[PDB]
C-alpha cells in the first residue's frame, strides 16, 4: 500500500538539450594565407637561384677537367 512508483522526470526539470547547428568559423583570412604562400615561393626561388648558380660553376669546373684530359 506504499506510494505509487512510476518512471517519471526528476523534481523541477531535466537539463536543457542542445539542438541547433554548431559550426565554428575556425580559420585565418584569405590575405594571410596568400601572403604566406607567396613568401614561401619567393624564399624557395632565391634558394634555388643560389644553388643553381653554384651547380653551374661546378659543371664548368668538371668540363675544364675534361678539356685538360682530352689531348
Amino acid at each position: 500500500a506504499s506510494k505509487v512508483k512510476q518512471d517519471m522526470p526528476p523534481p523541477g526539470g531535466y537539463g536543457p538539450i542542445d539542438y541547433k547547428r554548431n559550426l565554428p568559423r575556425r580559420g585565418l583570412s584569405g590575405y594571410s594565407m596568400f601572403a604566406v604562400g607567396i613568401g614561401t615561393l619567393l624564399f624557395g626561388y632565391w634558394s634555388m637561384m643560389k644553388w643553381n648558380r653554384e651547380r653551374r660553376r661546378l659543371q664548368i669546373e668538371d668540363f675544364e677537367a675534361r678539356i685538360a684530359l682530352m689531348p
Binding site: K5, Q6, D7, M8, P9, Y14, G15, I17
Partner: protein, 53 residues
C-alpha cells in the same frame, strides 16, 4: 561517403537498446497498440533517453 554511416549507426544501436528495454525487441517491438501501449516504461529509461539526447 562511407564514414558518416559508421558514425551514426552507433547512435542507431543505442536507440535499438531503448526499443528493446521498452519492449524486448530491438526493431519489431509491437509496443504501440490500439488501446495505448503494451507495457509501462522501466524505472530508469527516461534518464538514459535524456543522456542520449
Amino acid at each position: 561517403a562511407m564514414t558518416p554511416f559508421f558514425w551514426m549507426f552507433e547512435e542507431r544501436e543505442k536507440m535499438f537498446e531503448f526499443y528493446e528495454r521498452v519492449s524486448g525487441a530491438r526493431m519489431h517491438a509491437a509496443y504501440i497498440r490500439p488501446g495505448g501501449v503494451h507495457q509501462d516504461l522501466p524505472l530508469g529509461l527516461l534518464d538514459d533517453i535524456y543522456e542520449f539526447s
